[PDB]
Design an enzyme around this catalytic site. Structure first.
Site, PDB file in Angstrom:
ATOM      1  N   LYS A   9      39.107 -15.617 -29.758  1.00  0.00           N
ATOM      2  CA  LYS A   9      37.896 -15.821 -30.376  1.00  0.00           C
ATOM      3  C   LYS A   9      37.302 -17.195 -30.555  1.00  0.00           C
ATOM      4  O   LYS A   9      37.217 -17.661 -29.530  1.00  0.00           O
ATOM      5  CB  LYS A   9      37.757 -15.633 -31.858  1.00  0.00           C
ATOM      6  CG  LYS A   9      38.788 -16.886 -32.351  1.00  0.00           C
ATOM      7  CD  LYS A   9      39.177 -17.140 -33.667  1.00  0.00           C
ATOM      8  CE  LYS A   9      38.353 -17.988 -34.529  1.00  0.00           C
ATOM      9  NZ  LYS A   9      38.216 -19.077 -34.273  1.00  0.00           N
ATOM     10  N   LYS A  14      38.314 -21.209 -25.576  1.00  0.00           N
ATOM     11  CA  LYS A  14      38.631 -20.316 -24.777  1.00  0.00           C
ATOM     12  C   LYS A  14      37.882 -20.775 -23.342  1.00  0.00           C
ATOM     13  O   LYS A  14      38.911 -20.641 -22.540  1.00  0.00           O
ATOM     14  CB  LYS A  14      38.270 -19.154 -25.384  1.00  0.00           C
ATOM     15  CG  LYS A  14      38.085 -18.191 -24.014  1.00  0.00           C
ATOM     16  CD  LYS A  14      37.473 -16.758 -24.665  1.00  0.00           C
ATOM     17  CE  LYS A  14      35.648 -17.158 -24.892  1.00  0.00           C
ATOM     18  NZ  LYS A  14      35.040 -16.867 -24.242  1.00  0.00           N
ATOM     19  N   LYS A  40      27.900 -17.493 -27.451  1.00  0.00           N
ATOM     20  CA  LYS A  40      28.276 -19.230 -27.883  1.00  0.00           C
ATOM     21  C   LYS A  40      29.330 -19.954 -27.633  1.00  0.00           C
ATOM     22  O   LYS A  40      29.709 -21.131 -27.871  1.00  0.00           O
ATOM     23  CB  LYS A  40      29.919 -18.904 -29.466  1.00  0.00           C
ATOM     24  CG  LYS A  40      28.508 -18.338 -30.628  1.00  0.00           C
ATOM     25  CD  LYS A  40      30.111 -17.167 -31.549  1.00  0.00           C
ATOM     26  CE  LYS A  40      30.692 -18.729 -32.027  1.00  0.00           C
ATOM     27  NZ  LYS A  40      32.083 -18.439 -33.189  1.00  0.00           N
ATOM     28  N   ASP A 128      35.426 -12.528 -30.731  1.00  0.00           N
ATOM     29  CA  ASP A 128      34.792 -12.401 -32.710  1.00  0.00           C
ATOM     30  C   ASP A 128      34.656 -11.159 -32.922  1.00  0.00           C
ATOM     31  O   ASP A 128      34.711 -11.287 -33.772  1.00  0.00           O
ATOM     32  CB  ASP A 128      33.806 -13.639 -32.268  1.00  0.00           C
ATOM     33  CG  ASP A 128      33.380 -14.533 -32.589  1.00  0.00           C
ATOM     34  OD1 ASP A 128      35.209 -14.921 -32.312  1.00  0.00           O
ATOM     35  OD2 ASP A 128      32.821 -15.709 -32.076  1.00  0.00           O
TER      36      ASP A 128
END
Ligand code: SF4
Lengths: 270, 270
Positions: A9, A14, A40, A128
């Site tokens: 997510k 990450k 993102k 996500d």
């Protein structure tokens, strides 16, 4: 050539872990390509030292077609000769994240990027939404070894479980396996035990616990990995340890996703 | 009937703000339906007091077809008569979030769920990925008034900008318009000023600043809105103020998305 992907997510570091892992692999003289698949995060920022690498979708638009693109425009070398490309996120409101990824993979195949003396490919993929779009690297048979970045937080563990459900779907009919969970520490009470328990329920391993360290943010600010910023840092040895375990990893399993009841009981216990 | 959607990045309390807003509208005597379109949040938990409402996709898959579902399986009444439906996220690794959303909308229309004397419908939509899938409420001409939940955090403001780019794509095809930014406070210094400045750059308004208040979390852990849990609370008046401003809102715009350089200038100016 080992074809790998990092899923997890957003908002838990990450892409930071992916780049510090890849820097640690390059430091061991591994030839690595990163393919950014995360709208993102900047998947190549800390390797290239670039605020936002031009994406395959962007430069197919700017030139007007993808056969006109040259590999030099799309694939950039950074720290330790690591080769970096960004797929490009979906056209806002209209596109599918899968379009950018398919375009990137087909272009790299055609241009010979995958036969150029590579030890590892890492797809850096957003987890996500566990949809068919973000599954593209697995669907294309381009990633067989999945590592999941999570944390001792409900939504990070929910994402890890849902990513595992996706792996089973493509493992019921092909080559994809879970290599392990990477715990990005949130400086939380006995957090490692929570991710070990989850790994044990999934039939995998916690391959490394990545501690919280000021030096990660300090390196990030200078658009580099801890490996490059502060090679003698304790945190640099944390990524080296993770890199060594990935290189040596034989535990590639079809995971056993858990019920929401099981996950809730885990979270309440911890 | 006013057809609205709340878009925003995950992990900033968007679905908590949506349900608290809707509970305040119901408290005022407004008839409201919530359609959950967020695989990272329980869009109806705080209205139904239920941990995870059964989704249209889950129940359709089980029953074989959506035409075998009864409206009462799908549409549940909670606090203040608020009607609640969950679309259901993508089938892990294979589905598209758009499929649950189109399935939910078509089922509700056909079953006469929109024929009822509703004042408002709110689609609670994830804004982590601004793809065609998450744009479905806009595409099916089912949401006209968009409100963006954000915070004084880089990625929340980036998501607000990305959602705004999606709105521009459809702005010449129908009456889909941005009604305002809702700031979910994360107790950043000058956070109210930062989101007022962002709204002004986008050509909209910060329609309300939702303060950080622990009563929100105390209600949420008990699966309630503040409006139901503690109607005398300061924070309950905050949601009442937001609700009254949405009811009275006349500012509906085609937003003016900013460049990353404009966004960075803002962040460094604060
Ligand atoms: S498959 Fe995923 S990325 Fe593609 S449009 Fe659907 S939800 Fe969006």
């Amino acid at each position: 050539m080992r074809q790998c992907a990092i899923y997890g997510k957003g908002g838990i570091g990450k892409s930071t872990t992916t780049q510090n892992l890849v820097a640690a692999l390059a430091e061991m003289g591994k030839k690595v390509m990163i393919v950014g698949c995360d709208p993102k995060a900047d998947s190549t920022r800390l390797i290239l030292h670039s605020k936002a690498q031009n994406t395959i979708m962007e430069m197919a638009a700017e030139a007007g077609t993808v056969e006109d693109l040259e590999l030099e425009d799309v694939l950039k070398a950074g720290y330790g000769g690591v080769k970096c490309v960004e797929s490009g996120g979906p056209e806002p409101g209209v596109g599918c994240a899968g379009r950018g990824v398919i375009t990137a993979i087909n272009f790299l195949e055609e241009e010979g990027a995958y036969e150029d003396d590579l030890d590892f490919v890492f797809y850096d993929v957003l987890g996500d939404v566990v949809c068919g779009g973000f599954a593209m690297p697995i669907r294309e048979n381009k990633a067989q070894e999945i590592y999941i970045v999570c944390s001792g937080e409900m939504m990070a563990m929910y994402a890890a479980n849902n990513i595992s459900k996706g792996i089973v779907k493509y493992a019921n009919s092909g080559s994809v396996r879970l290599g392990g969970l990477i715990c990005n520490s949130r400086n939380t009470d006995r957090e490692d035990e929570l991710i070990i328990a989850l790994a044990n329920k999934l039939g995998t391993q916690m391959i490394h616990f990545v501690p919280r360290d000021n030096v990660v943010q300090r390196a990030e600010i200078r658009r580099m990995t801890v490996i490059e910023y502060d090679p003698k840092a304790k945190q640099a040895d944390e990524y080296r340890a993770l890199a060594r375990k990935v290189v040596d990893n034989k535990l590639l399993v079809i995971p056993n996703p858990i019920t929401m009841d099981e996950l809730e009981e885990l979270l309440m216990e911890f």
